[PDB]
């Protein structure tokens, strides 16, 4: 009865140039569920909703990565994780997490909309860039993050409804 949906979208930059497309891992109760990219999604299996939504997110995260004023040295990855859980007692947890080169550097709890900033000032720099970007460029508000939680939960429901 406790369930979780976990999206994991990765975008890459090479020598500071953000690559085309993206790669998304979706996990349903920790079981690998979809692997999506620019082209299509892969588990009458139609994933037009997923392809649309993940593509849009891919586009957003590429903007976000482009806004990181880090270095144009080698490969870098920006990876956003979105999790939502439906607990046994019907309560929810939900969160948003950014990894830069596999290091968790920023999280938001989507139940409370509180961010946890990392310890190292480097990681904090990354966090502040991204937070700037999200608030200023993307113009993201509380509503957006409420909606993000809801989207995730709606999808988790939807998937549970079918199988």
């Amino acid at each position: 009865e406790p369930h979780s949906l976990r999206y994991n979208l990765t975008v890459l930059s090479w020598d500071g140039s953000v690559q085309s497309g993206f790669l998304t891992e979706v996990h349903l109760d920790g079981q690998p569920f979809l692997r999506c990219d620019r082209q299509k999604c892969r588990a009458n299996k139609t994933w037009d909703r997923e392809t649309r939504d993940l593509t849009g997110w891919g586009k957003d995260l590429r903007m976000t990565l482009a806004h990181i004023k880090d270095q144009k040295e080698g490969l870098h990855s920006l990876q956003e994780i979105r999790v939502c859980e439906i607990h046994e007692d019907n309560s929810t947890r939900s969160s948003q997490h950014f990894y830069y080169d596999g290091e968790l550097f920023l999280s938001q709890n989507l139940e409370t909309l509180e961010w946890t900033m990392p310890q190292s000032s480097r990681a904090q720099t990354l966090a502040m860039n991204v937070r700037n970007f999200l608030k200023e460029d993307a113009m993201e508000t509380d509503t957006h993050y409420h909606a993000m939680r809801a989207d995730c939960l709606s999808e988790l429901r939807r998937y549970l409804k079918s199988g």
Partner: protein, 253 residues
């Protein structure tokens, strides 16, 4: 086609016999309804994905004319009209009896007293004839302040997107005026526009030769290339011209 978009209020978006306006002043639902009513109109009614496909590109969340009836448990439009299915996806975000529109024809349940931005909409027929007509545009194009726009969601590379706009006797998006094109603030995602980098000169110019006006766009280096994607809040993200993306045509200046 070259048809004048019918009677609308001055500098409203006119698209397929429907006038629209986006208010980025965040008011609650009630305030927002009154605001639309004060302009002889009402909050956004979504009756058709086809006639209102402009709504697919909208950024952020905006109060919509949709309301929940506690007794019925049904969703109706402000005027009592029934919510037809295969239009909206109703999403439980907040506990409340009003809905925010958001793109991909989604509808987020929100508390009616929460300030949010809003969209007024009125049909062309219910505006009287002594009113503003949007300048000559092709039949199914979004007319805004006499400029004509259409968004092609079938993603193509820059060159094909140009040719695509050329085939309809148009060109890719040319930003020349934050005021006259303030509609562009509410576009979500990014889209090919007609802004091209000349690598030799290191300059930026439009499809038709015009040079880029200063203080019109923020340019961010994203992907090395000689073409620019428009993105919201007047940004121009540099992108490889061969990368397939969506695009925006416009009838030329």
């Amino acid at each position: 086609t070259e048809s004048y978009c019918g009677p609308c209020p001055k500098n409203w978006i006119c698209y397929k016999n429907n006038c629209y306006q986006f208010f980025d002043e965040s008011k609650n639902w009630y305030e927002s309804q009154a605001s639309c009513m004060s302009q002889n109109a009402s909050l956004l009614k979504v009756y058709s994905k086809e006639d209102q496909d402009l709504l697919k590109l909208v950024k952020s969340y905006h109060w919509m004319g949709l309301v929940h009836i506690p007794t019925n448990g049904s969703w109706q439009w402000e005027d009592g009209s029934i919510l037809s299915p295969n239009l909206l996806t109703i999403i439980e975000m907040q506990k409340g009896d009003c809905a925010l529109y958001a793109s991909s024809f989604k509808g987020y349940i929100e508390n009616c007293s929460t300030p949010n931005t809003y969209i007024c909409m009125q049909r062309t027929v219910q505006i009287p004839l002594t009113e503003s007509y949007c300048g000559p545009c092709p039949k199914n194009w979004i007319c805004y302040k006499n400029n004509c726009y259409q968004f092609f969601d079938e993603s193509k590379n820059w060159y094909e997107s140009q040719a695509s706009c050329m085939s309809q006797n148009a060109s890719l998006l040319k930003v020349y005026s934050k005021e006259d094109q303030d509609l562009l603030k509410l576009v979500k995602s990014y889209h090919w526009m007609g802004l091209v980098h000349i690598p030799t000169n290191g300059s930026w110019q439009w499809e038709d030769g015009s040079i880029l006006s200063p203080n019109l766009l923020t340019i961010i280096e994203m992907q090395k290339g000689d073409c620019a994607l428009y993105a919201s809040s007047f940004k121009g993200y540099i992108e490889n011209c061969s990368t397939p993306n969506t695009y925006i045509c416009m009838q030329r200046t």
